[PDB]
Design a protein around this ligand. Structure first.
Ligand SMILES: O=C(O)COc1ccc(Cl)cc1Cl
Ligand SMILES: O=C(O)COc1ccc(Cl)cc1Cl
Length: 569
């Protein structure tokens, strides 16, 4: 647990963060003893430990598990069995996660104490942000987030996202500009995005930070602005909400900010939105914002160049490393280069072990710099030695606390037969290849992929949506550069792929298909119409569903094949 502290006392908060990252071994051992002692009579723990609370019996007798191994406990609680199947405290909500098992979202128990500890630690960490980001304390955080539905279990437990649970709790015991639909559901995402942007624009002079779950989340906001800014501004000029907004939360709530006709504010926003280039639009619309906070690591690293284009120099920050299962780390250097983000594990948030990636698990303090690990977390909400499914690389120490860079999920995205191409390798390959377009004033906006086993020999298909700065005439890549892009992806894949191409002969030439602009919004709307969470949506890096494939296939303009065979010993 975390000690009592004054969140208004910035020096006391920073001094506590130093303590927390210095006494790492002692805090970890304290956390473990507390979890094992308090949960000793749960059905889950007693079956393995029979009352022991010492670390060595823990390591010997408690198995390392995945969500698949423990799902039955969660389902039984969802059906009405008591929280003490897994936890000595009541389960207050189930969290719907991104990442599945299988093929639905994981449902993760959360206790009220765990939730308040996470909120507590967030207020412990904000003074560091304020110390690093001048002016951040001077205004509000405009957070682009909304929820379109929620549910409850058979026994009546609420099912929510972690963000909603986080916001709802700090709201119930208090600086944030958050949409009326971050907590209260609205099925119409058009109404919810409209009201949230209207509020954000009305409050633009009070906004010190922009936030969203992911880097790509901002592109959906910007796309909506491109289509609807004149109507938004018209509402600001007249002080009158457009009458097609029927959602009761927006219509009853909007009067708080839409207080009177404001022609001058409307004209200011129109002046920015009517410019040809939307470069720096985010800073121009929110000129007092001090940073843009979202996940920019892993798959989201792909959107950094485009988000920086819209950012006008606002630093892109990624402050937090966490999951439904556990809040895990923070960035002690929030203004670092987005490519240099590392997260320091916070020892009081759980007991953290690490599985070497390449059966061998080490304690947090025994991690090896430069080696890859999957976190194995033991928590205060009924998870014990639970595999989180991320791969982190240990990069150093903040005081005595290891810090890690996010490598990726552990996920095969493409496989013709014995080739198993992982998401992190495909991402690095596409990163290498898309660089070749920079001399031609072209940018890769998004991509996905599929295995084409139709014919003779199977091969990878990568779908590329391209854009540029010229809105005046057609843009198009020459075939020579596209063909070298194909090769550069291939040369970046692993030895099994490359041996397949050069030696084995069972893998054919990689293919890049350029899709028309808007292809990846059509793809997204396809998944949304089938129940995907809007706020948790990420472009999947490969697609198998036949209706999504048919969507990508009829957006295809040009196709290109690698003309060179990749190298391999
Ligand atoms: O750790 C995480 O996964 C994200 O946590 C948060 C941090 C800050 C704010 Cl404002 C909201 C949330 Cl959900
Ligand atoms: O921006 C902020 O205020 C804190 O970070 C977040 C807040 C809300 C959401 Cl959804 C995602 C992120 Cl990364």
């Amino acid at each position: 647990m975390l000690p009592k502290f004054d969140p208004t006392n910035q020096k006391a908060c920073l001094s506590l963060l130093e303590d927390l990252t210095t006494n790492v071994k002692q805090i970890q051992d304290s956390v473990l003893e507390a979890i094992l002692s308090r949960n000793a009579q749960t059905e889950y723990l007693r079956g393995f430990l029979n009352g022991q609370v010492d670390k060595q019996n823990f390591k010997k007798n408690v198995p390392v598990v995945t969500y698949e191994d423990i799902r039955s406990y969660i389902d039984r609680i969802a059906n009405g069995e008591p929280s003490d199947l897994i936890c000595d405290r009541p389960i207050s909500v189930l969290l719907t996660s991104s990442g599945t098992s299988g093929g639905v979202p994981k449902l993760i128990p959360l206790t009220t104490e765990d939730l308040e500890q996470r909120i507590s630690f967030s207020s412990l960490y904000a003074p560091l942000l304020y110390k690093h980001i001048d002016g951040l304390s001077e205004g509000k955080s405009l957070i682009f987030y909304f929820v379109t539905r929620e549910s409850k279990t058979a026994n009546g437990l609420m099912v929510r996202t972690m963000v909603t649970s986080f916001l709802k709790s700090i709201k119930q015991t208090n600086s944030l500009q958050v949409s009326p639909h971050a907590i209260t559901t609205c099925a119409d995402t058009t109404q919810s995005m409209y009201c949230q942007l209207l509020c954000g624009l009305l409050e633009r002079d009070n906004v010190a930070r922009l936030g969203a779950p992911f880097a790509s989340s901002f592109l959906k906001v910007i796309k909506f602005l491109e289509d609807h800014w004149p109507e938004l501004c018209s509402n600001i000029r007249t002080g009158r909400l457009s009458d097609w907004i029927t959602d009761a939360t927006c219509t009853s709530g909007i009067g708080k900010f839409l207080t009177a006709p404001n022609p001058e504010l409307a004209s200011l926003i129109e002046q920015e939105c009517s410019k040809t280039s939307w470069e720096a639009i985010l800073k121009r619309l929110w000129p007092k914002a001090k940073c843009i906070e979202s996940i920019i690591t892993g798959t989201m690293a792909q959107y950094i160049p485009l988000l920086e284009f819209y950012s006008g120099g606002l630093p892109l920050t990624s402050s937090f490393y966490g999951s439904s299962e556990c809040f895990m780390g923070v960035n002690f250097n929030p203004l670092c280069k987005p490519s240099d983000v590392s997260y320091t594990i916070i020892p009081c948030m759980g007991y953290f072990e690490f599985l070497e990636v390449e059966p061998v698990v080490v304690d947090l303090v025994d991690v090896k710099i430069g080696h890859d690990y999957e976190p194995v977390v033991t928590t205060f909400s009924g998870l014990y030695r639970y595999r989180v499914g991320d791969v982190l690389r240990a990069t150093g120490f903040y005081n005595n606390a290891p810090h890690f860079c996010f490598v990726g999920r552990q996920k095969v995205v493409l496989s013709i037969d014995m080739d198993k191409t992982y998401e992190d390798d495909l991402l690095k390959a596409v990163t290498n290849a898309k660089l070749l377009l920079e001399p031609h004033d072209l940018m890769l906006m998004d991509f996905t992929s599929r295995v084409d086993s139709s014919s003779f020999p199977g091969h990878y298909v990568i779908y590329w949506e391209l854009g540029s700065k010229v809105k005046d005439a057609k843009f198009e890549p020459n075939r020579d550069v596209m063909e070298e892009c194909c090769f550069t992806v291939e040369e970046s894949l692993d030895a099994v792929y490359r041996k397949g191409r050069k030696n084995d002969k069972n893998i054919g030439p990689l293919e890049i298909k350029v899709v028309k602009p808007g292809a990846f919004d059509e793809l997204m709307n396809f998944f949304l119409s089938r129940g995907s969470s809007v706020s948790q949506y990420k472009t999947p890096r490969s697609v198998t569903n036949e209706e999504a494939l048919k969507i990508l296939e009829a957006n295809v303009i040009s196709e290109f094949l690698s003309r060179k065979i990749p190298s391999w010993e």
